[PDB]
Nucleic acid binder design. Structure first.
Lengths: 51, 115, 49
RNA sequence: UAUAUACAUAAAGACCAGGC
């Protein structure tokens, strides 16, 4: 589950753009690697790299 | 930021009566005067002039609180002498004292200079 | 002598010059009052400080 | 003549100093 924007609000900085809560980074690190794990199993099905 | 104005002690704004007279139901012939914007200078003179009057059973003042400026003077007199009469004769007797003191202090000055 | 009534004070009082310090702590900087003001972003509760 | 200018933004965290 991915908790809603309320539970992980952004940070609006008038100086430059926005900052993001810890979860939004911690959830980005999951979606990156989950996707790398999507391709390997779908493309090469290489067994030792998945581990 | 909450400090009250300095002038707020001796100046009356709109609607404040100087004196407020309220009868006292505990006692016959008892009255209670309320003087706004005064302090122990004025209250103590009168109390001590009321206790010379042999028809005055009780007289006293208090400042209810020091940060608000008003005096509360209870007076109880003997029957057939009104506590408003007691408090007026007090004020006219000081004026007849202090007018005698200001004249006797002027004589002692002229005597004092070159005499 | 009493200041209000003029009369002496029965017990004798101990007076002398003494050296006092005024402290960084004043009431104007410690005073605070709150009614329906700013509100925290995440908790929707009142701000701190 | 009518009608209008209504409020939001300064993040959060860390350590340090002091208060009762």
């Amino acid at each position: 589950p991915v908790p809603p924007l309320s539970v992980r609000p952004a940070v609006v900085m008038q100086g430059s753009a926005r900052n993001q809560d810890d979860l939004t980074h911690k959830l980005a690190d999951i979606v990156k690697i989950n996707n790398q794990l999507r391709r390997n199993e779908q493309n090469g099905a290489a067994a030792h790299v998945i581990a | 930021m909450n400090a009250p104005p300095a002038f707020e002690s001796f100046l009356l704004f709109e609607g404040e009566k100087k004196i407020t007279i309220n009868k006292d139901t505990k006692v016959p012939n008892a009255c209670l005067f309320t003087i706004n914007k005064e302090d122990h200078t004025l209250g103590n003179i009168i109390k001590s002039q009321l206790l010379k009057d042999p028809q005055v059973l009780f007289a006293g003042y208090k400042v209810p609180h020091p940060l608000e400026h008003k005096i509360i003077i209870r007076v109880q007199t003997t029957p057939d002498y009104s506590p408003q009469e007691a408090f007026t004769n007090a004020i006219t007797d000081l004026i007849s004292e202090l007018s005698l003191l200001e004249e006797r202090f002027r004589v002692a000055i002229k005597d004092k200079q070159e005499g | 002598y009493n200041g209000f009534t003029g009369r002496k004070i029965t017990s004798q009082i101990f007076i002398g010059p003494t050296y006092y310090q005024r402290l960084k702590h004043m009431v104007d900087d410690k005073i605070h009052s709150r009614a329906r003001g700013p509100i925290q972003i995440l908790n929707r509760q009142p701000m701190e400080g």
